[PDB]
């Protein structure tokens, strides 16, 4: 068992799937929280300059989806076979796409596009991942994985800039709730810092 | 199994998967689309996107989560969990930045202006960052070749259409780029595969 130490904003953001695992499997771990003015110095330091980080017995892990999948390697949220596996990392990545493409650190054109995004093409993944879990209990196989765990924080965010985003979609409104009513998850979201995003 | 991988005629995001492929000498029907047939294949799709890969009627997606399942218990894939981790964030770095790039964007003016940020400003820092990370080891992960040093090759490869001038500083990166060209397999493919500029 190492000594985790996550580094990031204060905020959920690319950090929170780390977070739902830590708390999922009971592992202890420090919250580091940075303030935006002591960034520049972290910055500095970091092989590739970007967080979330997670350092492992002082080594330096980057990449949250990466560093996600290292600490669900052996444990039931990974996907049961090599194929469920599969579609975990695909479900993921194409979650993280799509919020990837909102223009974060871009006013005026941020507003555009963030409209555009949110009005023309969140429902069509809305729909897609709708059709995808295809009146299942969880998107990938008979149990919880982290990429349930990474729709319910991608849509958590999502909602805050669309409250709309799930009303044609109850189905997917029934994963969040079941999601969050997981009793480590459920205690982490009672605890967790309030925080915008 | 029957594999059928699905894709534009383009290296592109496909290209991962069809390198290692070629290095597991796993046979696999390449399918190039028509631009013609796209607007109509499209509506089939898991999620609107190929690359797709089905594997015995079975439809995969993302083409990293495919190459990711296909190097599974492979050489290709790192030696330890914590090494499996350095091969994915390597990846993912590479990913975030390339997909950064407007390539669909239709108004050429905002396309070049984009195009021209990223890699004189951007690129250089990956660039950068990528060589300090490798140091003067053999491969980008380990002792062994992995995915990550592919996708090292595949991603440079077209950043040096748009900017040949891009390892100029980097004779690291450059004999990293002709160690993943000089692998057997992979020589074959490139000198196989159809001659695209993306
Ligand atoms: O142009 C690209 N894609 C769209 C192709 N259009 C579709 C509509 O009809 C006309 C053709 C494209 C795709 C992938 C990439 C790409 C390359 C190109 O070799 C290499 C690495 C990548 C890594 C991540 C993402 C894209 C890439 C660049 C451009
Ligand atoms: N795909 C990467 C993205 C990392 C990333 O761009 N993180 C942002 C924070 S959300 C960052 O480091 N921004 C500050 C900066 O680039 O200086 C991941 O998931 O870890
Ligand atoms: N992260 C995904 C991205 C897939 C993707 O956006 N593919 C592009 C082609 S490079 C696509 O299908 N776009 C055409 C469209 O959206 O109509 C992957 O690597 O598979
Ligand atoms: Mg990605």
């Given at each position: 068992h190492p000594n985790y130490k996550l580094t990031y904003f204060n905020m959920r953001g690319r950090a929170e799937i780390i977070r739902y695992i830590f708390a999922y499997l009971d592992i202890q771990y420090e919250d580091h929280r940075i303030?935006?003015?002591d960034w520049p110095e972290i910055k500095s330091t970091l092989p590739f300059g970007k967080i979330p980080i997670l350092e492992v017995d002082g080594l330096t892990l980057h990449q949250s989806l990466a560093i996600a999948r290292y600490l669900t390697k052996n444990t039931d949220l990974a996907?049961?076979?090599?194929?469920?596996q599969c579609h975990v990392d695909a479900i993921v990545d194409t979650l993280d796409d799509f919020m990837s493409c909102f223009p974060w650190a871009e006013q005026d054109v941020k507003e555009q596009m963030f409209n555009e995004l949110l009005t023309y093409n969140a429902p069509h993944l809305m729909q897609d991942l709708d059709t995808y879990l295809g009146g299942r209990e969880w998107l990938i196989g008979n149990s919880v994985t982290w990429a349930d765990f990474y729709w319910e924080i991608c849509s958590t965010t999502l909602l805050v800039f669309k409250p709309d985003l799930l009303d044609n979609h109850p189905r997917l409104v029934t994963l969040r709730k079941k999601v969050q009513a997981i009793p480590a998850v459920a205690n982490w979201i009672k605890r967790r810092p309030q925080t915008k995003l």
């Amino acid at each position: 068992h190492p000594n985790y130490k996550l580094t990031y904003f204060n905020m959920r953001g690319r950090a929170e799937i780390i977070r739902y695992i830590f708390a999922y499997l009971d592992i202890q771990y420090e919250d580091h929280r940075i303030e935006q003015a002591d960034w520049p110095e972290i910055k500095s330091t970091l092989p590739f300059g970007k967080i979330p980080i997670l350092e492992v017995d002082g080594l330096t892990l980057h990449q949250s989806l990466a560093i996600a999948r290292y600490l669900t390697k052996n444990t039931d949220l990974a996907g049961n076979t090599e194929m469920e596996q599969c579609h975990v990392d695909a479900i993921v990545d194409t979650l993280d796409d799509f919020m990837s493409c909102f223009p974060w650190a871009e006013q005026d054109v941020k507003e555009q596009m963030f409209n555009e995004l949110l009005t023309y093409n969140a429902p069509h993944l809305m729909q897609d991942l709708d059709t995808y879990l295809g009146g299942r209990e969880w998107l990938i196989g008979n149990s919880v994985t982290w990429a349930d765990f990474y729709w319910e924080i991608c849509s958590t965010t999502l909602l805050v800039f669309k409250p709309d985003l799930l009303d044609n979609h109850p189905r997917l409104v029934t994963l969040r709730k079941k999601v969050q009513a997981i009793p480590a998850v459920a205690n982490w979201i009672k605890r967790r810092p309030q925080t915008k995003l």
